[PDB]
Amino acid sequence: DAVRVTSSKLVTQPGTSNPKAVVSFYEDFLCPACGIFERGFGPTVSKLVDIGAVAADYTMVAILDSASNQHYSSRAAAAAYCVADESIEAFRRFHAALFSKDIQPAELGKDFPDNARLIELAREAGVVGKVPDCINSGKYIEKVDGLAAAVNVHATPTVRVNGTEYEWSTPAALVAKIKEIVGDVPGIDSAAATATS
């Protein structure tokens, strides 16, 4: 249901493979607040992933999907899952790209990327593989369309920390929360520096 992003440095619960800290993001690719939120928190989260402070769970839901936007939300989420299938790193780059200012369509706009453009963005993210057919076949469409109800999240962006609702403010606040959970890990202060710019 979520794409789990980690690195080889992941800090785990003693005697298990399970992350000590999991930050679950629930996003819609057409959600403007989500664009702002990801452009703001992204580098910090990526750093926290790299130093192994957290695992980052991404659930891309369909809640904004409509015929008016040409089902952009659902096609984009499905596409993202397709990419994650091939590569996790490719997913990081893809996910980041879709939320960049030059890319994310304006909700309520008349212009939205078709599947060919999503495919091309996947290529730029570093993967081809089965992704083109995974996207063209609409493999994940029904999945993503059901995700919102599945995980029971109807608002975006929504963030949870170890399954608990988390009201986010700044990247710094988040870094501090994670530090509260995992203690002082190598790099986490560096991550705070990333959070404050």
Automatic annotation (TrEMBL):
Name the Gene Ontology molecular function terms of this record. Answer: oxidoreductase activity
Q: Name one GO cellular component term.
A: plasma membrane
Q: Alphabetically list the UniProt keywords.
A: Disulfide bond, Membrane, Oxidoreductase, Redox-active center, Signal, Transmembrane, Transmembrane helix
- Cystine pairs: 31-34, 82-134
Record's keyword annotation contains Signal: yes
Membrane as a keyword of this entry, yes or no, is yes
Instruction: Tell me where in this chain the Thioredoxin-like fold domain is found.
Output: 15-179
Q: What are the boundaries of the signal sequence?
A: none
Family according to the record = Belongs to the thioredoxin family. DsbA subfamily.
The protein in question is named Possible conserved membrane or secreted protein
Organism classification, top ranks?
Bacteria, Bacillati, Actinomycetota, Actinomycetes, Mycobacteriales
Indicate the span of the full protein covered.
59 to 255 of 255
